[PDB]
Design an enzyme around this catalytic site. Sequence first.
Site, PDB file in Angstrom:
ATOM      1  N   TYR A 145      30.801  14.158 -22.967  1.00 54.70           N
ATOM      2  CA  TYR A 145      29.727  14.980 -23.528  1.00 54.70           C
ATOM      3  C   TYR A 145      28.789  15.486 -22.441  1.00 54.70           C
ATOM      4  O   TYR A 145      28.467  16.674 -22.399  1.00 54.70           O
ATOM      5  CB  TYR A 145      28.949  14.177 -24.587  1.00 54.70           C
ATOM      6  CG  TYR A 145      28.081  15.055 -25.466  1.00 54.70           C
ATOM      7  CD1 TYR A 145      28.654  15.949 -26.348  1.00 54.70           C
ATOM      8  CD2 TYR A 145      26.696  15.023 -25.374  1.00 54.70           C
ATOM      9  CE1 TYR A 145      27.887  16.780 -27.158  1.00 54.70           C
ATOM     10  CE2 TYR A 145      25.907  15.850 -26.231  1.00 54.70           C
ATOM     11  CZ  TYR A 145      26.523  16.731 -27.078  1.00 54.70           C
ATOM     12  OH  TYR A 145      25.809  17.582 -27.928  1.00 54.70           O
ATOM     13  N   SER A 163      21.933  19.458 -24.188  1.00 55.28           N
ATOM     14  CA  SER A 163      21.505  18.110 -24.451  1.00 55.28           C
ATOM     15  C   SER A 163      20.688  17.660 -23.259  1.00 55.28           C
ATOM     16  O   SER A 163      20.846  18.250 -22.194  1.00 55.28           O
ATOM     17  CB  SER A 163      22.741  17.212 -24.606  1.00 55.28           C
ATOM     18  OG  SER A 163      22.358  15.848 -24.654  1.00 55.28           O
TER      19      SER A 163
END
Lengths: 227, 226
Positions: B159, B146
């Site tokens: 995350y 990401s």
Amino acid sequence: QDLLNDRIILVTGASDGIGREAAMTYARYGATVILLGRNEEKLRQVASHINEETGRQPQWFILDLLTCTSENCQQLAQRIVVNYPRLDGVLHNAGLLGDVCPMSEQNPQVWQDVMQINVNATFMLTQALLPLLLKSDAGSLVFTSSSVGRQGRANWGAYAASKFATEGMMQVLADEYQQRLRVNCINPGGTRTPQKLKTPADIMPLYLWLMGDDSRRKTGMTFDAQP
Amino acid sequence: QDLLNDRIILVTGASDGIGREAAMTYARYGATVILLGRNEEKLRQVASHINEETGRQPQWFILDLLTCTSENCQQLAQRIVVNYPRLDGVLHNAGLLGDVCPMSEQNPQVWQDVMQINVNATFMLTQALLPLLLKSDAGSLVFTSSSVGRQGRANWGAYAASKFATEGMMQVLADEYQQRLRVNCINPGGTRTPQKLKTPADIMPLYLWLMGDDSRRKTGMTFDAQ
């Protein structure tokens, strides 16, 4: 010298080589030090030695990061609040190295333990201690990284993954606490854990700098204690 | 076309979202696909759709990354060995987002689960599948990253920490398997959980490229889909 007079600093993993040295150094420079670790007997001995050497006796608290819950961390903060009005610094030095061997050979339980101590419990303890840090005029939160937290290398498996996660956590926190906390990482480098390596005493200047006022406008960064 | 003819590729998180789209795309390009996921009904559905589009029916295996142990992952690999001679590709697309909120507000249970799925179980499954990947002429192992795996940003909590860990794992693996496997990450960017963003179909070019021959000996890199 007086860099850390009137500063209250908590040091985790305070019985190990770097942690003991950081606690002693901070005390020598004027800090009120709080030691955190697994073993009451080792912490008592560290506190006694610091007292003999500095005239200041640190208090200690017990927490086992491998097994602690968030509730245990919150209880620790409550014990701190009885006796201290704030924390000016938290040094997260506790950690587990785990297996140094190829990924195909890394033990999955050891991997999970490395992540649990280095990342999950370190996060839970940080969360418990944020309110106390916010009470400082300029709280400083320091995580321990590694060269393999910036560039992964063969054989470093869980430790590498956990130290990349540490850099990422540090960056998220630094972004959230702009102008409120300073949040940074230290990579101690290879340390005398052989005559080739520097000792914990040798790498202290950066540990001191991150807790003293000279680094107040420094956040979001990762520093090498050597090179 | 036939980019992936005679390539055996395992796709995790295959039952929905980007994983489902990647499994279907790889199959359309000639791959023999193996679907991994937690939900049998959905995996059966995806397998059925792929069969309709290609005349080849993919097999599926159940694995829940939230709960699996290393032994579970080893047993899964034994089942694959019964059915397949190698794996040419593994695409790790399973993940959990968890809480998007400040660090002071992150739920520690959700944090633990994001790390368990995105890091620990992804590692354990990789470990189990390495021998099969080494049987490929040029195995390719792909993790999902990401933007917040390269630059941590406020509110991204577990995350972000888990995608940083994913980049580090990828880098360790790429270093260990120099000259032996291709190991890379893909950052899909913002995609379908909204009408403004790209769909999973739109980001497939990179997913195909990493499995096809044109990416051989690209290793240790992280790519934006992007």
